[PDB]
Each structure stands twice: as C-alpha cells, then as structure tokens.
Design a protein around this ligand. Structure first.
Ligand SMILES: [Mg+2]
Ligand SMILES: [Zn+2]
Ligand SMILES: [Zn+2]
Ligand SMILES: [Zn+2]
Lengths: 524, 46, 50, 67, 446, 260, 49, 115, 42, 49, 50, 48
RNA sequence: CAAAAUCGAGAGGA
C-alpha cells in the first residue's frame, strides 16, 4: 500500500484453514481496482475527491491515488479471501448488520460490463439473451468508424451521413468515446399494429423522413492492382488497351480509361465496367487483356486513385469507389435491446398516423416483439427519452442506479403536458379518424446494421459452371448456383414428386450422354 | 497526354510519363493521387 | 404433451424388427442388410462398401 | 457530420440554427433555455439539435489533398 | 420468356425439416428487392423477418409444373399427416385483433361495414340486416365474421378463459362471459375466437373447413380473415406501453408481503437444519431434502406472486390482450414483467459455490439464503441489483449454450432415420414393401 | 344528396403559420385537405446539380442532397412555371426551370462557412428563403484554407408526393372533437389525460358526456410553413389543387361513359 | 512494432501532431501493420504454471 | 436496384386510362370503377360524398396493394338510378363544396389580415 | 471528510474518470509489448 | 463425390433473397422482385394457340 | 364398432331424430368420406414416417 | 462439452458476462470488463 | 464470341 518494494500488481493470498501463504508476481494474472475499507469506513475521504476534481492543475492523477493507499488491485485469487461491500451503504450499521467486517468496496457495480455491453441503457430491465444479442449487433452498426477515414484504403467501409449521440446514455459511454464517433440516429418510434406490414420482427419506416437524409449511408470499396514484371517471359503493364491487340477482352467498352490506363476520379462507373486496363504480354497479339472490372452491378463513382511503388518497386494502384445507400425495403435495423428486424414497407408522411400536433413517427414496430422477449429497457428508454427531449438533457441509463425509476420519469413527464405513461392519441393518416386505442410513442435510438438486401439478392439461370464436374459455381461473386442438398431430396421423395426431382438433380445441373457397349457395359 | 498527379505530401502538381518511377520532384514522396476528371456527372439533389 | 400419429411410429418399429433380430439404425445394422451396393454407399462408409 | 437541413420528422429547417444554438450555449443558457429561445417547440426538432455531434470540425484538421 | 405473373415456383427454407418446408406458390411480380410472403405461411417454413432468407426454384417443363401444381401447392398441404391437424393457422396481429373483433360488444356503423365488406373476395353481394335497427343501424363483429366463414360448417369450441365450472350450473347456453364458441350453419352464433378456435389445434374452424369444404374454399377463408381483420385494426389499433407493465400500489404491497413471508420461512428451515432438527425423507439425503424443501418454498412464493399480478390487471391491459388471444407470450411473462423474476437454476440446481463456499465475494461463507444462491426478488420493471444481474446472466448462458449444442446430434438422427426408411412405399397390392420387395406391413398402419 | 356549406373562422395569421378552423363538413373532406397540404402543393426546389469542383470534406452526392433541401421562394412563380415534363423546350429553359450558381474558395486561416447566401440565382423572384429580407442562412459546408467548391444547379417545380423536398409545410396539426364526446377514443382512465388547448370543460370533468347522435364537425387546423409559401397561400393552393384533381377525374369519367 | 507503443513514432505526440500526420487522435493503437493490413494478437488462456 | 421511379405514383403510363368502368354480376345496379394513379386522398372523399345520397345502397373503395397505384370503387344504387349518375353527382357536389369553401377562406383572410 | 451518501454518486465517477485518463482502454496490449521489448529480448 | 455431387448439387434456375411480410397476397402467392423475374426464364413451346 | 353403435336404432330415434331422406344422404356421405381416406399406392410412407 | 462454456462465478469483475459470440464459439470467447487490468510481470527477488 | 484459379485460416448471417 505504500508502493514500497512490493509493486502494486503483486497478488498475496493467505489460505487459513490450511496453513499456507502464497505470493505471485508472474505475468498473465487479471486484476481490478477496489476501494480499501477501514474498520467500517472507506479510506477515500473528500480530500481526495477535492484534489482529483482539479486533476488538470494539481496533476493529482490516478497514480497518486493508488500511491496513497486508497485503491488496491485485487485479483481473481485474492478475491477468495476478501469481503466486498457492493456500495458504501453496506458499510452502514444496519438493524441486522449483514457481515460488519468488510474489507473492500466496489468503485461502481456497472464496471463489470464490457465495451459493447456498456452501450445498452437500462441493461438491468432486460432479459439476458437480449443483452447478449445487442452486444453482438453493436459490432455491425454503421457509424463513423474513424476520424481520418478520408485517407484510408480499407477494402470495405460504411459511413453514416448524420450520426447522433443517444439522448439516453450510460455514463460508461463517456470513456468509450461514443459521444464523438456515434453509430446511429434517434428516431421517433411508435409501437402499433398498423396495416400489417410490421409483423414478425419487421418495421415500417417513413419515406419522407428517408428523403430528408434519415439513415442514409455511403459505402466505399477499394480495388488493388500491381503490374508484375516477374519475368521477361510475361510482364503486365498499365496501358489503355485496344480492340485490335488484346485477346481476352469482354464486350465491355474501355473508353473510360485514361492514357495511363487508370480511370480518373469523378467518373460514374456502372456495374461490369473496367477500372484498370492491365495487359500482360503474350508469348489480339503479343498481349492479353487482364483488366480489372468492378464487382458486378455496383454502380459507384470513382472516389480517388492513388498510385505508388510497392516494396519491390513496381507500380501499385488503389482505386476507391463510392456507392450511396439509401434505406429501403429489406434493410436490417436494430435497437440497443436486441430488437432486430428488417424494413417491411415505407409510407409517405401523409399516410402515417399523426398526433394532435402533427408528429408522425419515423419507425413503427410491432407490439408483439415485447412480451415474448421481455425487453422492458426499450420502453423505459422511450419514456426517459421523451422526458429528456422535452427537458433539454441527456438522461442517465446507467444500470444499477437507485435514483431513477419509472415513477420518477412518469412524474417528470406529466409536467410537460403529457400523459404520464407515454401514451398519446394518434389519428389514422389514411382516413383521419382517431384510433380507438392510445399509441405509445417516444424517441428511441436505432442503429443500421451492415446487412442490406442489395448484397443478398441473387439469381441464376444457366451461367458458368465448375471445371471438374460441370455443375454451377458457388457464390454470388462467381454467379454461382444454389445447392439442392440432401434434405431437400428427402423432402421431395416424401412429396412423391419424382419428375421434379429428376429435373432438379439431373437436367438443371449436369446433363450428359455416354455410349456403352451392350456386352461388357464399359463405356465404348 | 500529360497525366498530372499530386504529390501526396507537398501537394505539388507534377507531370509523369509512363514507365517512369513514381517519385516527387520537390520532396521525394512516393505516393501520388490522380486529379479530378473533367467529364460531367449530373446529380439529382434527391 | 406433443402428438405424432401412430402410422409413423408403427412403421418405424416394424422396419426395425422385420428381419427377426433387432436392427440398429446405424451403419452396423442398416448398412449390413441386403440393400444392394449403391444405396449402401450413399448412406455411409462408401469406400468399403464399393 | 454536419447539422441536417431539415428536421427528419416534421421537416422544419434547423440548418440555420446550429451556430446560433452554440452561441446561446456559451452565453450560459441551459439547453432547455437556448432551445426555447430559437423556437423549437416539438421534441422532434429539439431531438435534432440536442443530439447533434459536429464531426466536420475534426475533418477540418487534416490538410487538404490539393493545395 | 422471362418469368411472368402466375408461374409455379417451389419455395424453400433451410433446414428442410419436413415436407411443408418446400411448397408451390404462384408468382406475383412486385417493385422492391425482397421476396414478399404472406403471414399464415410462416409457421410451415418456420420463418420470421429478422433477416431470414429463402430460395426459389422454377420448374422448367409442363410435366414439372403440372406435378407441382397438383401435389405441392400451399392449399393442398394445410392439414399435415404427421399429427392430422392443420399446419398453418392464424398468427400475431390477426389473432389478437380477431379476438377483439368478436367480443360481445363490438358494434359497427354502416360506412365501416361497407369498408370491411370491400375486402371480402367471396362476398355474395348483399348487405345483411343489422343486429340493431333502432335507434341506429349497427352491425356487430360476429355478424361480419359469419360472412367470412365458408360453406355451412358446424363447430363447437371453448375460449381459453372459459370458467370451466360454467358448463355445470345454469347458463350453460347463454354464457355470461361469451365463451363457448358455437358456429352453426356457417354463422358465428356466439363466442370469442382465439388460438383454440383458429390456431393449428385439431377440430378448429380451419380444420373443419378443410375437411368439409375443398381446399380452395379454405384458401379463401385464410385470405379473407387476414384482410378483413387488418383493415379493421386500422380503426381499432393495438399497442403495448409502460402503462401495461405497471400495477397499483395495493398489489405491489401484496407481492412484497408474499416475498417477505417466503424468505422468512427459508430462514426458519435453514436454522432448523443448523440445529439438527431436520430429518431426511425416504430416498433422499439431508442435503437433498433440505434443497428440495427450500426450492418448494420459493416456487410456491413465485406462483402466488404471479397470480396476484395476473389478477391485478384491468381488462384494457395489452399484455393480457396478447396472452388470452394466444398471439404471443404466456402468464409467466406477465409474472416476471410485473411481479418477480424468481429463481435462477444452473443445471437444475441453484447457483453453485464457485468461490470457496461462496457464490460471490459479497456474501459470507456457508450462506444458503435465497439471495445468496440466486433468487431474483425483482420484476423486470423494478430493475435487478448487481448480483441478480450476474446470476441471471449465468442462467441465460445455460440457455444459449443449450440452443447452440443440441442441434448437431438431432441433425444426425434425422439423417440416419431417413436413410434407414426411405424406400418403403405403399404398393398397388395395397401392401407396404421396401426396395428389396419384402413385406413390411400387410396394410398401411394396420 | 347535395354538398355541404362549410364555414371558415380564422384564429391567427403570421408569416410562420395560420391557425384556422373549418366547420360543418365531412371528416373525409377535412382529412383530404390535410393530405393535400402535405403531398400535393407545388413549390420550387433544386433537383439538378453539376459539381464542377469540390475539395471540401463532404463527397459530391452529400452536397447535392443537402442543396435540394434548401427552401426557395415559390410564392408567385410556381403557378407560372411548367413541369419540365410539360414543357416542350429542351432539358432546361426559363419556363420550366431556374438556374443557380455557386463558386466559393477559401483563403483565410479561419474556416469559411458556405451558406445559402452564396447561392446566386438567375431569376430574382426565386431565391433561398433566409436570404429574403433574425435567422441566419442554411450552412451547407465549411471550407478550411485551401478547399474550393464550384457548381451550377437548376430548380424545378414538383410536389411532395414525388419527394419530401417539395413538401411546402413543416407540420399540419389537426384535431376534432377535443373533448371525447363521440367516444372515438376509449380512455381506460380518463383522468390521467391532459386537457386539450381547444377543450371547453371545467377542470373537474375529464371528458364530455356521450352524444349518440353527433358526428364530427369543427375540425381545428394549424398549418405551419417552412418558408417557400406563406401559409394562407399554401391553403389556397391546396383547395385549388384538390378541386382541379376532381375536375380532371370528372372529365375522364365523361369520356368513359360516352364511350360506353 | 505495435502502434502507439514506446518504440512507435507516434509515441508521445500531441493531438495536433497526429492530425498533421493524418493519424487519428482517437485510434487507440495496440496492433501491428504487416503488409499494410492491421493485425491484432488475441489473448490466449492457459493453465497456471 | 429495383427501386421504381418516384413519378410512377401519379404519372399515367402510356395507354393506361384514368378511369375504367365495369359491371358487377353479383347484384343488379352495381359497378366497379377502377381509377389509375390515385390513392386514399380522392377515394375517401368520393366515398363519403356518395354515402350522403339516399339512392346509393352500397359505396366503398379499396386500395388493392399499397405498392401499386390504383383504387377500386364499388357503388350500388336503387333500380331507378344508375351508379354512373351517382358518381358524377358526387364529384359535382364535391367541387361545389370546395369552391364555396375557397371563397369563404379568402374572405376570412381578407378580414383577419386587414384587422 | 467522509463522503456523504449524496456526494457518493459523483465521487465514484470522478474516480473512474481519473482512472480512464491515466490508463486508457487498450493499456494491456501496449504494456505487454513494452515488457517484451524492454526485457524479454535481452 | 457422392454426398456432395450426386445426392445434392448446385442447380440452375434458382434465386435467393430476403423475405418480408405482405398481408395482401393470398396464401398461395409469393412476391418476386422485377430483377429476379427479368433474369429467370422458361421455355414455352410455340403453337398456333 | 363405432359406426354400428353411434348409428344405432335407438339413438337414432331418441337423440338425432333423422328422417328417411336424411338417413339416405348420411349413408352416402359416410361411404364417400371413408373411400377418400385410403392410402394412395405409390405413396412414400417411409420418408413420411422418418 | 458445455462445462468450459459456462459463465463461472469467478468472472465477476474480470470478464464481461453478457458479451459473447452466440454461434459455435459461445462461451469460449470473452471480453475484459472495463477496469480489469492484466498484470505484466515482475521479478520475485526483492520480495524474497 | 463466352470471359473470372485452387487449397488453408478467420470472422459473420439465419
Ligand atoms: Mg429469422
Ligand atoms: Zn512533393
Ligand atoms: Zn421536427
Ligand atoms: Zn421548359
């Protein structure tokens, strides 16, 4: 505790039933800071808080705080022999003192969570698999991934036009820098059964909000190429080819290229065009086209073309293309409580259900997603967010915090001329008449996950095939086929449909004839 | 025919022919960027 | 509390005792009866069968 | 990266109220007070101003490509 | 020619677990970029729209088209041979709504009725007589559903909340609560409709219509129910809010008092066992009898609190609205969202002593209380204190791993059985035989 | 079997919004007026951009999109112009469109704010709104020392059913039966509910007694504008547009019946 | 060399310098560059010795 | 990729007729008008006006699919009338109501603005 | 001297902010590499 | 070879893409985007009909 | 057994009260609805059962 | 075998309870809690 | 007139 010869990270156990003392200095042990407790009192007095509060003048950092015997690193094995107060209230002499010989305290309980689970607001009102899915979907949510993205040739990148910090935000988010590189937008969500297109984890977006920039994105994709002079036998080179000299030229025109053989920034490339005209000298003469095409049906704009020399010293190139992604039917959107779902339909502003001041929603989600999942944090977030946006704050959703509960949010909400529990009367946008029920509506933070339908639609009708067994290739990239596996074959045998089965497994895949001797039966 | 680039570091135009090693002639910097084209793309402000 | 018709359960039991001894649903019992080589090679253990 | 021209929900122009909102803020008005100064009534428009994260200022640190 | 409207396509979702996982649909060409499906047909495919995907095949012949049209079409598959009950029934918003449409006091105007009758395909054309002609012409919801019901079918069911003693005393045939559905000459004489009446049970209206009428009549029956009821729910609306998750102060006090009682009894049991005053039951040691008694105490406490919560709710509560209709969720969800989350078991036992005789370092050693071993005495609306958060995480992890490790073995079993039985088939002799042509069953299924 | 006789009583008028009330008419008609205010009133708005140069930190599509959503003044011109589909001229011409320009370069070490004040229009009747003679201008982009933006864009006539940038309003607020007399909403607890601004009830009483006979009359409108059109102009253009839609439909109907 | 570590050129630089090097002030470091790809060494568990 | 152009919602494709009248063999004196490139805005007003007539036995309308741009109106009148007549009279009375309303709004504006 | 229950809820967050200013989030990677280079190579 | 290329195999004339609700289709209809249909074909035999 | 009991001569006079036309229709109905329940040969009951 | 895939009591404060990949690596990949700090190693000479 | 490899590792989606 004095920072004496024993460094801070030295675990020190004392088995007591058996009579051993064990001291560890090895590497790899995990540990966490705790507060040290006197008889029944913290050693952290307000002297220390006063000196830290001006941490930027006194340079009274955290190091001076461990150095003064106030916090202590206690690791997984020395924890077997401490008695932790959860909070300095456990210290208070209770009517029936629970333990009354505490050794340490937690600094705060909410620091038992990670970097993606620390985004979830009110995680302690959610059922646990909800929190785990959100942890896993917060890593797929398009935002701003880095401040200097304008100079990076990442292979793929997604950047969100208008990211917004949450109106309801845990205090741990301060230190994850989530307030400076945020990954989503605040929406006015309504929980309603409305026209039937938001059933089964699907949502109804608004087309007018989407024509004003809502959840729009840009998608960047970079293409490498290098001219290999590996041998005088065959060497590549950048050069605008011609219809006469190359052999392996597709019908795609080569006009967009420049004299050096590289398309210039600001050219609207379409799908199946040429971005690098690379011709390898042959042993349609003395050179074969080896041009680089785009990934099919992408239709971006050339963003920039960097040229440079690699390690060994040939020409190197990186072309970056930029495709803008407006949200549309089939795009996956999710909230911070494991509530994922594709978009089912879009309505214009005048077909959405509005309020007595014409606040139409941005998103409408089904009331059936709630009861099976038990994500109450979603509803408290909507309620707290409404209060916050009417009050001009940013609410506090930190998990274990007795100062905030539903009754207080509701009382706060009643004072801004609202029903306390968040309900409103909406009118039907198609026909104008009130809706007999009151719809629950408020501001919620959504994310836009990387899974867009334009990267998943596929279709094959007699394209290329594999070289060994003349069956279709696999993948959208290869213009591939879809596998008619063994379970489907069993299903169609149950169906009794033998002609369709023959057609799938013979005629659609690999037809072929062979001539066979009638005597030995070995292929003549 | 000229194919001007931009020296990635000193932001200096410099004109380089084919089969010529990429090397800036103000500061020796090895990375250079093509310039914006002259064709006309229309955008719908939509 | 689930329910499955009886025809299917009876068919499975009768397939599985139709030869007089207990037949296991495995490569030891299914693949050792007289199904002819090609079906056997389809199910499991192709090389040995052929 | 930069203050949206229109409120997404209602379509009210909040493009011309960002620098003003900041100036109000450094005049020691609260967020609520500044927002009632500018005439944003609905919590949608206030959501738009109060949740902005101005990143363009960062991007004006990196020096341009073409000097 | 390019694929056009009305072509027959087979439609598949993987894993392909039964013959309803491939079915023949008719094409309908639409603007955007997804395969739009109907909703009733998400039970056979076992689908939902949280990013699922599905394949589409296109038969390339008149042979294959005719075969698919005559064998694999979606109408033809409504009743399944596995368990001889319909395989697709009504689902979420349609189910909640139709439970509401059919309550005894849903009266429709004139303009509203004509709206709703615009979405009946199988409408003869003639507006029926209202149930009330003076002071105002008002139709009711049974009176419109009676137009949806096909043919002249006859059916009897009983709503889920039917007080079972009711059929004993008087009032058997005028239900005070409007349960005891009775369709009779294809006209809903009385009763509320729910899962038990339109779901995939056996003997439901969907099933009886299938057996009695064609399968085109039933196809239209599904479609009409869905469209009419969605276009009423535009008028009626459905939500779930916070206001549904709250209970009044009185019931909160009941719940807290029950919990206090239960914890006190568990303390009593513990100190008995500490005084050697507890004696084992037959077939169980002292540890096991002790644990069984404590678990029984706490389970009874959870049940009592759940009942108190369920009873506290008013009849506008939307949780209860989606529970009674069968649409989504069950009463344990209401208990946990309102009353108390209960005990978290990890492999069927309370939380284990992973530290040295401690579940965590916040408790003293040899602590067998309810809090120490993982009893969550909070609702999902009151929050969870940090230790309950950790124990709840442990329980959820058990569930996740289970879902993620069962699947391989079951898949193997499915494959193995298929290859075992595949070639048995019913012959023109009416016998059942295998490929080798030996008898397996002299008659199918005896 | 004959039309209504509505009456209009106007409660407020500014350059920001009109607060009026119709009375003695159908709900369908009232809500169709509401739908027309949003989606079928035409205004001017940039919808053709051509970036001749851009060094700024935002890509080109971003700038185009962010230019379309600047309101222009469509006060008296939009009736005179033609839809470009309807104009027989080429791509552009003074009957169908209006040309804008923007050329801005930064030289000082302190960030230049491009705004809608630097859009110079060809036609003097059509201009950005904040520019019109307080509220500052719509910040389009910021240019540090070195960047430069130069473009040339065209403004055309459309309506909000095509794209949300041609929607002239900024929120129609609509209401009827402010006290729940018709029981078109069933409050499970009518006392928790705040009273309406239009409601006429003593504070003890929560909702009005049920009135079996009445149906909606007296709809309360509150139309707020974005700046393209002054509000009363929005409403007058809306009534004209709905009436003209019905006139065209009736002409087509006469044609069809004549054919039959 | 792991980035931002004591033998990286960005060690001890102030934010203004990082921006003037086209390096993000916020990027935390802790990875390697091998042929211009970013690699991260994932921590491995093992039994105590 | 499969995004229809935004002007499909209201611009008539070439050869498509605005309105298209049918009979209805279900019952006598019924018709089915199909109107192209329209939506609830005109459907609801026409329908509500029809229900004011006492010689209209059944009026309703439906939008078959949100993602195509037509409505269908079904009107059934008494035997001494004719649903085409009823439709025309409804549109006539809607136009008169709108004209009167526009005039009265102009007068009210003149007043309030004049103070 | 003692932190009363009403100041605790920001005492703890001053402390945690000081911690994360001292260390960072990815300190463990960087520190392990510094160890390796400083000592284990030698 | 056997289970990978005789019992199951890749097949022509087949699309994949995401499913989305649609209440307005009958139970035996499916919605197909325009591009999928534009891509896949069907050999219709010419007759005087 | 089931048919012979439910379709009795006493039940049919005290419970159901059918008439002669009704009985003839009922008999035709039972015959058809029975004859449509029989397995169709060529049915693959093995894959169905599995 | 699911025994090594379960959340152990001993992860309190060290490893995060909620964040795991829910596929086939479930419970086998883990993220450090926020303040958890992994020691780097020292020399046992001065203590001894 | 069809142009565009294979093998291992990892991360994901339902
Ligand atoms: Mg799914
Ligand atoms: Zn240079
Ligand atoms: Zn707004
Ligand atoms: Zn023109």
């Amino acid at each position: 505790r004095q920072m004496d010869i024993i460094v801070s990270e030295v675990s020190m156990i004392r088995d007591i039933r058996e009579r051993e003392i064990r001291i560890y200095t090895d590497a790899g042990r995990i540990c966490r800071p705790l507060l040290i407790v006197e008889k029944q009192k913290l050693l952290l007095k307000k002297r220390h808080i006063d000196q830290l509060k001006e941490r930027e003048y006194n340079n009274y950092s955290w190091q001076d705080l461990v150095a003064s015997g106030v916090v202590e690193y206690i690791d997984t094995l020395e924890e077997e022999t401490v008695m932790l107060a959860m909070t300095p209230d456990d210290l208070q002499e209770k009517e029936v003192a629970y333990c009354s010989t505490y050794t340490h305290c937690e600094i705060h309980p909410s620091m038992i969570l990670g970097v993606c689970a620390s985004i979830i607001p009110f995680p302690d009102h959610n059922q646990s698999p909800r929190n785990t899915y959100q942890s896993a979907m917060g890593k797929q949510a398009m935002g701003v991934y880095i401040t200097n993205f304008h100079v990076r040739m990442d292979t793929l990148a997604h950047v969100l036009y208008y990211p917004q910090k949450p109106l309801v935000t845990t205090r741990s988010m301060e230190y994850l820098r989530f307030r400076e590189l945020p990954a989503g937008i605040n929406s006015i969500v309504a929980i309603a059964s409305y026209t039937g297109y938001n059933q089964e984890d699907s949502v109804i977006m608004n087309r007018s909000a989407v024509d004003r920039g809502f959840f729009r994105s840009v998608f960047y994709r970079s293409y490498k190429e290098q001219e290999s002079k590996k041998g005088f036998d065959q060497e590549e080179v950048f050069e605008k080819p011609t219809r006469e000299t190359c052999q392996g030229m597709r019908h795609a025109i080569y006009d967009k290229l420049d004299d050096d053989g590289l398309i210039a920034p600001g050219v609207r490339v379409s799908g199946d065009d040429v971005i690098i005209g690379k011709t390898v000298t042959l042993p349609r003469y003395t050179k074969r086209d080896c041009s680089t095409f785009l990934r099919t049906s992408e239709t971006g704009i050339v963003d920039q073309v960097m040229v440079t020399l690699n390690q060994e010293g040939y020409k190197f190139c990186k072309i970056r293309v930029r495709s803008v992604r407006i949200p549309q039917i089939g795009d996956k959107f999710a909230s911070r409580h494991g509530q994922k779902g594709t978009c089912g339909i879009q309505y214009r502003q005048e077909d959405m259900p509005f309020t007595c001041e014409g606040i139409t929603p941005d998103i409408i989600i089904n009331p059936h997603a709630i009861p099976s999942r038990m994500t109450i944090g979603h509803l408290i977030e909507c309620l707290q967010g409404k209060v916050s946006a009417n009050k001009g704050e940013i609410g506090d959703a930190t998990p274990f915090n007795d100062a905030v509960n539903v009754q207080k949010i509701s009382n706060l909400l009643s004072d801004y001329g609202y029903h306390l529990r968040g309900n409103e009367v909406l009118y039907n946008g198609f026909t104008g008449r009130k809706i007999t029920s009151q719809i629950f509506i408020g501001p919620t933070y959504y994310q836009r996950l990387k899974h867009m339908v334009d990267d998943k639609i596929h279709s094959r009708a007699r394209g290329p095939i594999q070289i060994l067994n003349r069956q279709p290739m696999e993948g959208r990239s290869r213009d591939g086929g879809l596998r008619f596996g063994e379970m489907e074959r069993d299903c169609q045998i149950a169906h009794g449909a033998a002609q369709f089965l023959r057609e799938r497994l013979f005629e659609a895949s690999d037809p072929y004839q062979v001539h066979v001797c009638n005597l030995c039966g070995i292929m003549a | 025919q000229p194919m001007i680039y931009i020296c990635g570091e000193c932001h200096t135009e410099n004109e380089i022919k084919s089969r010529d090693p990429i090397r800036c002639r103000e500061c020796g910097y090895r990375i250079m960027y093509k310039k914006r084209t002259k064709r006309l793309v229309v955008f719908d402000a939509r | 509390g689930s329910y499955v018709n009886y025809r299917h359960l009876a068919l499975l039991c009768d397939t599985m005792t139709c030869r007089g001894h207990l037949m296991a649903i495995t490569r030891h019992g299914v693949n050792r009866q007289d199904t002819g080589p090609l079906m056997k090679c389809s199910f499991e253990e192709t090389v040995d069968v052929l | 990266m930069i203050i949206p021209v229109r409120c997404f929900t209602c379509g009210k122009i909040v493009g011309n109220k960002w620098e003003a909102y900041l100036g109000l803020l450094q005049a020691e008005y609260t967020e609520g007070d500044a927002l009632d100064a500018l005439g944003l009534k609905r919590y949608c428009c206030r959501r738009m101003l109060l949740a902005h994260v101005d990143l363009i200022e960062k991007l004006l640190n990196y020096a341009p490509l073409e000097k | 020619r390019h694929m056009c409207d009305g072509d027959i396509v087979i439609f598949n979702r993987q894993p392909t677990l039964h013959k309803m996982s491939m079915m023949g649909h008719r094409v309908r060409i639409l603007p955007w970029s997804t395969f739009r499906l109907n909703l009733s047909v998400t039970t056979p495919y076992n689908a939902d729209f949280d990013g699922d995907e599905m394949n589409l095949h296109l038969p390339q012949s008149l042979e294959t088209r005719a075969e698919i049209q005559e064998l694999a079409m979606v109408p033809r598959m409504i009743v399944t041979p596995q368990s001889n009950r319909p395989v697709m029934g009504i689902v979420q918003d349609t189910l909640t709504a139709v439970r509401k449409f059919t309550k005894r006091d849903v009266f429709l105007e004139r303009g509203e009725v004509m709206n709703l009758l615009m979405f009946l395909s199988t409408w003869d054309g003639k507006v029926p007589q209202p149930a009330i002609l003076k002071p105002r012409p008002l139709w009711t919801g049974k009176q419109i559903f009676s137009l949806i019901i096909p043919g002249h079918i006859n059916c009897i069911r009983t709503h889920s909340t039917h007080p079972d003693d009711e059929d004993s005393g008087p009032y058997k045939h005028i239900s005070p609560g409007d349960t005891k559905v009775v369709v009779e000459n294809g006209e809903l004489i009385m009763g509320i409709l729910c899962k038990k009446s339109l779901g995939t049970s056996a003997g439901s209206l969907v099933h009886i219509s299938y057996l009695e009428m064609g399968h085109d009549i039933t196809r239209l029956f599904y479609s009409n129910i869905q469209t009419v009821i969605n276009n009423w729910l535009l008028i009626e609306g459905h939500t779930i809010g916070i206001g549904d998750s709250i209970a009044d102060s009185k019931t909160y006090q009941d719940i807290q008092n029950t919990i206090k009682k239960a914890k006190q009894d568990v303390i009593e049991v513990i100190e008995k066992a500490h005084n050697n005053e507890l004696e084992p039951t037959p077939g169980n040691t002292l540890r096991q009898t002790f644990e069984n008694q404590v678990n029984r105490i706490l389970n009874d406490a959870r049940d009592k609190t759940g009942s108190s919560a369920q009873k506290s709710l008013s009849e506008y509560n939307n949780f209860k609205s989606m529970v009674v209709s069968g649409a989504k969720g069950s009463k344990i969800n209401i208990s946990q969202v309102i009353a108390v989350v209960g005990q978290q078991n990890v492999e069927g036992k309370r939380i284990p002593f992973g530290f040295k005789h401690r579940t965590l370092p916040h408790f003293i050693k040899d602590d067998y209380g309810p809090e120490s071993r993982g009893f969550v005495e909070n609702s999902y609306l009151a929050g969870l204190t940090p230790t309950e958060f950790f124990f709840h995480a442990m329980g959820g992890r058990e569930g996740l791993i289970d879902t993620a490790v069962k699947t391989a073995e079951t898949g193997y079993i499915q494959r193995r059985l298929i290859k075992s039985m595949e070639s048995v088939m019913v012959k023109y002799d009416a016998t059942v035989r295998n490929s080798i042509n030996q008898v397996v069953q002299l008659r199918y299924g005896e | 079997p004959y039309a209504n006789q509505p009456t209009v009583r106007i409660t407020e008028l500014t350059d920001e919004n009109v607060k009026f009330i119709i009375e003695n008419t159908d709900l369908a008609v009232a809500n169709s007026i509401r739908r027309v205010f949003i989606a079928e009133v035409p205004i001017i708005a940039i919808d053709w951009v051509q970036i001749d140069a851009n060094s700024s930190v935002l890509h080109d599509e971003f700038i185009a999109h962010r230019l379309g959503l600047i309101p222009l003044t469509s006060d008296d011109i939009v009736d005179k112009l033609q839809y470009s589909r309807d104009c027989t001229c080429e791509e552009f011409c003074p009957e169908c469109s209006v040309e804008f320009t923007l050329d801005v370069r930064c030289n000082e070490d302190q960030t230049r704010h491009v705004t809608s004040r630097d859009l110079i229009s060809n036609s003097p009747r059509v201009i950005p709104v904040t520019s019109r003679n307080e509220q500052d201008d719509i910040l389009i982009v910021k240019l540090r020392k070195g960047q430069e933006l130069r473009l040339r864009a065209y403004a055309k006539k459309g309506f909000g059913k095509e794209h949300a940038k041609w929607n002239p309003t900024a929120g129609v607020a609509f209401e009827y039966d402010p006290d729940n007399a018709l029981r078109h909403t069933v409050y499970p607890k009518p006392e928790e509910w705040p009273k309406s601004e239009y409601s006429e009830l003593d504070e003890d009483e929560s909702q009005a007694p049920y009135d079996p006979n009445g149906k909606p009359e007296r709809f309360y409108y509150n139309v707020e504008s974005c700046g393209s059109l002054r509000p009363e102009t929005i409403v007058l253009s809306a009534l004209s547009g709905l009436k003209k839609k019905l006139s065209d439909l009736q002409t087509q109907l006469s044609h069809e019946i004549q054919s039959d | 060399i792991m980035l931002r570590s004591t033998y990286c050129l960005l060690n001890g630089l102030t934010d203004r310098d990082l921006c003037e090097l086209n390096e993000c002030p916020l990027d935390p470091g802790g990875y390697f560059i091998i042929n211009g790809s970013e690699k991260v060494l994932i921590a491995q568990e093992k039994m105590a010795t | 990729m499969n995004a229809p152009p935004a002007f499909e919602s209201f611009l008539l494709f070439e050869g498509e007729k605005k309105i298209t009248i049918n009979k209805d063999t279900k019952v006598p004196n019924a018709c089915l008008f199909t109107i192209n490139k329209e939506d609830h805005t005109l459907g609801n007003i026409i329908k509500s006006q029809l229900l004011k007539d006492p010689q209209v036995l059944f009026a309703g309308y439906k939008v078959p699919h949100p993602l195509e741009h037509k409505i269908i109106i079904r009107v059934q009148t008494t035997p001494d009338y004719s649903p085409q007549e009823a439709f025309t009279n409804a549109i006539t009375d809607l136009i008169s109501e709108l004209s009167l309303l526009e005039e009265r709004f102009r007068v009210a504006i003149k007043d309030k603005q004049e103070g | 001297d003692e932190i009363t229950p009403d100041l605790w809820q920001e005492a703890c967050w001053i402390v945690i902010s000081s911690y994360f200013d001292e260390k960072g989030l990815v300190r463990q990677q960087l520190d392990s590499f510094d160890e390796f280079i400083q000592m284990s190579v030698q | 070879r056997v289970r990978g290329n005789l019992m199951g195999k890749r097949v022509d004339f087949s699309a994949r893409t995401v499913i989305t609700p649609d209440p307005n289709l009958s139970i035996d209809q499916v919605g197909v985007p325009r591009s999928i249909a534009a891509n896949m074909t069907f050999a219709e035999i010419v007759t005087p009909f | 057994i089931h048919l012979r009991s439910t379709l009795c001569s006493r039940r049919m006079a005290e419970e159901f009260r059918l008439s002669g036309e009704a009985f003839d229709w009922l008999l035709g109905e039972i015959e058809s609805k029975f004859n449509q329940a029989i397995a169709h040969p060529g049915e693959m009951v093995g894959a169905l059962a599995a | 075998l699911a025994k090594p895939r379960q959340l152990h009591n001993t992860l309190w404060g060290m490893v995060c309870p909620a964040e795991t990949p829910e596929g086939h690596a479930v419970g086998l990949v883990k993220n450090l809690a926020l303040m958890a700090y992994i020691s780097v190693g020292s020399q046992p000479s001065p203590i001894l």
